[PDB]
Chain A
Amino acid sequence: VFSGDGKDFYRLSGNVLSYTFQVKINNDFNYEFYNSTWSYVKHTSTEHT
Chain B
Amino acid sequence: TKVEHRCTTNKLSEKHEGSFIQGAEKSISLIRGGRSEYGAA
**Interface positions of A (Cβ within 8 A of B):** 4-7, 22-49
Main secondary structure of the interface of B (DSSP, over half): strand
Total interface residues on B, CB under 8 Å, equals 33
In the complex the two chains form, what is the Cα distance from A37 to B21 in whole Å?
A: 9
**Chain A residues near B12 (CB, 8 Å)?**
43-45
Given the known inter-chain contacts A23-B34, A36-B19, please indicate yes or no for A41 contacting B14, CB distance below 8 A: yes
Main secondary structure of the interface of A (DSSP, over half): strand
Check A25–B17 contact: CB distance below 8 A: no
Check if B22 is an interface residue, CB within 8 A of chain A: yes
**Distance between B39 CB and nearest chain A CB, rounded to angstroms:** 4
Check A25–B28 contact: CB distance below 8 A: no
